[PDB]
């Protein structure tokens, strides 16, 4: 299996790199070798390794975007995906006020990008990071934010209702966005959004454009079982979400459905 080997070579050489970006680069590398479309279809039928929503979402969006201009199409598509994060930070970091109390979920490079863009604009704020422990990743987020020279406090996992009254805004990076405006993320997003709604705090979602999946879960069981695995995945209602921060602009949760209707899956 050379596709999984190239995926591991593109994902393990840079630990600050996303997985769906490396998957679309693997699809483009198969498109470099019609026979190229057949090889890309073979490896995308053979890429059933990662259980993330963003990987399969980017694979489906590249499978639609591919359908001799396919290589240059994937080239500027990966150019837009690579230049997405700077537009994410530049459109999102303007909402953080001075002296605010930041609430943050587990480790993701997107919220780290928007916090380093926020401290790049001369802003002072304290960040409360939930530990989020099926595995210690919120500690890794607090360690990577302590190197950023910002005041961070490692918060216990069952204290998001304890610290909600003092955290004025709740900014959480999501790993998958369904059509209505809800998000698929790590399991502690639902309780944080419900405690933010009960305390009237604005719940912000910071995710890119390739995480737009065409699914519609009603309950916590209606998310697919291949993305669940002690679950790793919850679901947040779109009524619990104030705004989204994509590269197309700062969007209300009803705009993702507009983009997916104009895109047609």
């Amino acid at each position: 299996k050379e596709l999984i080997e190239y995926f591991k070579s593109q994902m393990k050489e840079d630990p600050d790199m996303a997985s769906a970006v490396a998957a679309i680069r693997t699809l483009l590398e198969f498109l470099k070798r019609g026979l190229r479309a057949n090889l890309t279809s073979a490896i995308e039928t053979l890429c059933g390794v990662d259980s993330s929503v963003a990987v399969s979402s980017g694979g489906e969006l590249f499978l639609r975007f591919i359908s001799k201009i396919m290589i240059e199409r994937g080239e500027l598509f990966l150019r837009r995906i690579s230049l997405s994060r700077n537009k994410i930070a530049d459109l999102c970091h303007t909402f953080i006020k001075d002296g605010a109390t930041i609430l943050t979920h587990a480790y993701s490079r997107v919220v780290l990008r928007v916090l380093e863009a926020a401290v790049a604009a001369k802003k002072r704020f304290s960040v409360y990071v939930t530990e989020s422990q099926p595995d210690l990743s919120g500690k890794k987020m607090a360690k990577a934010l302590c190197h950023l020279n910002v005041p961070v406090t490692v918060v216990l996992d069952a204290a998001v209702g304890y610290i909600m009254e003092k955290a004025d805004l709740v900014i959480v990076g999501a790993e998958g966005v369904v059509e209505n405006g809800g998000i698929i993320n790590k399991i502690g997003t639902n309780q944080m959004a419900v405690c933010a709604k009960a305390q009237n705090k604005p719940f912000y979602v910071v995710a890119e454009s390739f995480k737009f999946v065409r699914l519609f879960p009603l309950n916590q069981q209606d998310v697919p079982d291949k993305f669940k695995y002690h679950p790793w995945v919850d679901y947040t209602a779109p009524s619990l979400i104030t705004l989204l921060f994509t590269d197309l602009g700062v969007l209300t949760p009803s705009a993702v459905s507009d983009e997916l209707i104009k895109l047609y899956l």
């Binding site: 602009g249 969007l251 209300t252 009803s254 705009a255 507009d258």
Partner: peptide, 14 residues
């Protein structure tokens, strides 16, 4: 109020 962004796209440029 879940439709003001479409009027924003039809009347304004980003």
């Amino acid at each position: 109020p879940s439709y003001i962004y479409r009027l924003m796209s039809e009347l304004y440029h980003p």
